[PDB]
């Protein structure tokens, strides 16, 4: 025991299906004795834009602004904006980061994309060297808990949306694996708006039940083969 | 042959490599006699967050906020925030929409993701039914012009990032095709930061060169096969 969890949560409405999945996670992980922290991005009015306001004081090359370089240097010189370093501290302390969001355009809502863009800066999340298996958050687990509009059927290899694994690639491989996370299998709650009450409650219960043994889980092999292969 | 082009541009720095690609696109399309509009998202401080501020009228369900439902209804009633309908006018009038951006976590920067989330609402960009080949922006072309940190070699089937086409899927298929766009082949300018000044000039010149004959190109088959192979 002694585990710390950060839930990064991206829904506008507390009473939403996403809201419920977030609350079940808080309740169940809290019941287990885990340390639990929630970043409620919409409630925090979290800034999604990557701008020169993210660096306090003097820039490293004020003639030509390169956000990635400047935030690298700012991390090294401890001059990042405080909303960013507040989140970095939650991530640093976490053993597990759960992302709770509705799927927006086969990806995360923009407010959560901005969290990924602004929080996972060079020197904090990865470096040269130290990416993919050697990324700087190695030792930590990440989990995507996604809800969709489209049905499970639509999310098959030959269905109109293709396999759900296809849209996970930029998130699980390009982002989280790159930064060194080992990736737990995603939690995909398909089409709750279309689903009946019974089906919805079933999906909530599947999540709660998964959470009972989350610390027993093996990570997926975050590979092209897993995402695209037979 | 009287074509209208919208460039949706997501970089903070006019002197950046993205800025140059944006500017040569303006130069070359303007030279051709095309009508050209640029949505400079950072300069406009474009709002990326999907919030209830995006609806100014009476909500369909004020007790439980569902962004997608409320913006659909707001679109029909014409009570969307005006920054959204301003962009929708640009899209409505465009024959070709070029997206110019650096790759952030195998995707678009959050400020551009916010543009996609907020501008492409139900009723404007698609209906149910009325999506993929039946999407409401049918007849229009779209083109992703992407710059990367990683090398072309890293973005191959056997490289650590997997093939470049893999990360295009959520954008080309899940977003643009869903809304009815036909998709022109992507322009990917690999690893300019790492490249020599001469390799950089060459990549800019190649884009400019391609643009001379852009109106003669056919779209890709925006399918799982095109993105992922057999
Ligand atoms: C801009 C945008 C882009 C999108 N792009 C995509 C896309 O690319 N692909 C895709 O598939 N979808 C897409 N969607 C749809 C989106 O993913 C879904 O609308 C979203 O996942 C629904 O999740 P929710 O939490 O908002 O559902 P909700 O509407 O909040 O929940 C569904 C119902 O469940 C009820 N409920 C809440 N809690 C419980 C509970 N504890 N037990 C039982 N019932 C409960 C709620 O009251 C609600 O009535 C997009 C939507 C938007 C707005
Ligand atoms: C949050 C974040 C996430 C990222 N995630 C990824 C990822 O998942 N995968 C990945 O591969 N990369 C990733 N990157 C890297 C990113 O894609 C690159 O940093 C970006 O593409 C570089 O493009 P730029 O326009 O900013 O380059 P610049 O720094 O602006 O360009 C490089 C050089 O070109 C020069 N230049 C400008 N105009 C010209 C011209 N006309 N001729 C010649 N030289 C010129 C500039 O002066 C500069 O010196 C990420 C970066 C950030 C910040
Ligand atoms: C701009 C630095 N830089 C590069 C990068 C660009 C060119 C060469 C080496 C690394 C980068 C490359 C990849 N693949 C993924 C993420 C990042 C990144 C992420 C955040 C940041 N703050 C700077 C970042
Ligand atoms: C919430 C409506 N809704 C749904 C949707 C959700 C559930 C059932 C049917 C459609 C949707 C589904 C997919 N695949 C892709 C985009 C959207 C979307 C996009 C914008 C918006 N403003 C509402 C949207
Ligand atoms: C291995 C690719 N790669 C990266 C790199 C780019 C993005 C992410 C990780 C590494 C690189 C990054 C920096 N800063 C400087 C030089 C190089 C480089 C130099 C030569 C080469 N042959 C590959 C190179
Ligand atoms: Zn991986
Ligand atoms: Zn497609």
Swiss-Prot record, chains A, B:
Record-listed Zn(2+) binding positions: 173, 177, 222
Main location: cytoplasm
Substrates-to-products reaction catalysed: 1-(beta-D-ribofuranosyl)-1,4-dihydronicotinamide + a quinone + H(+) = beta-nicotinamide D-riboside + a quinol
Pfam families: Flavodoxin_2 (PF02525)
UniProt keyword list: Cytoplasm, FAD, Flavoprotein, Metal-binding, Oxidoreductase, Phosphoprotein, Zinc
Other facts: Uses dihydronicotinamide riboside (NRH) rather than NAD(P)H as an electron donor.
Family: Belongs to the NAD(P)H dehydrogenase (quinone) family.
Protein name according to UniProt: Ribosyldihydronicotinamide dehydrogenase [quinone]
């Amino acid at each position: 025991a002694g585990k710390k969890v950060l839930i990064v949560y991206a829904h506008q409405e507390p009473k939403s299906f996403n809201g419920s999945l977030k609350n079940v996670a808080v309740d169940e992980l809290s019941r287990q004795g885990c340390t639990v922290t929630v970043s409620d991005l919409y409630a925090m009015n979290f800034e999604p834009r990557a701008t020169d306001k993210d660096i306090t004081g003097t820039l490293s090359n004020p003639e030509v602004f390169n956000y990635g370089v400047e935030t690298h240097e700012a991390y090294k010189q401890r001059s990042l904006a405080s909303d960013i370093t507040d989140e970095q501290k939650k991530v640093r302390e976490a053993d597990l980061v759960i992302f709770q969001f509705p799927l927006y355009w086969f990806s995360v809502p923009a407010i959560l994309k901005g969290w990924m863009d602004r929080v996972l800066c060079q020197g904090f999340a990865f470096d040269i060297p130290g990416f993919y298996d050697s990324g700087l958050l190695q030792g930590k687990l990440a989990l995507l808990s996604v809800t969709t509009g489209g049905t499970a059927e639509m999310y098959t290899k030959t269905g109109v949306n293709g396999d759900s694994r296809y849209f996970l690639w930029p998130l699980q491989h390009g982002t989280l694996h790159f930064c060194g996370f080992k990736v737990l299998a995603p939690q995909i709650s398909f089409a709750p708006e279309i689903a009946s009450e019974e089906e919805r409650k079933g999906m909530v219960a599947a999540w709660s039940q998964r959470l009972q043994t989350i610390w027993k889980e093996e990570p997926i092999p975050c590979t092209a083969h897993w995402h695209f292969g037979q």
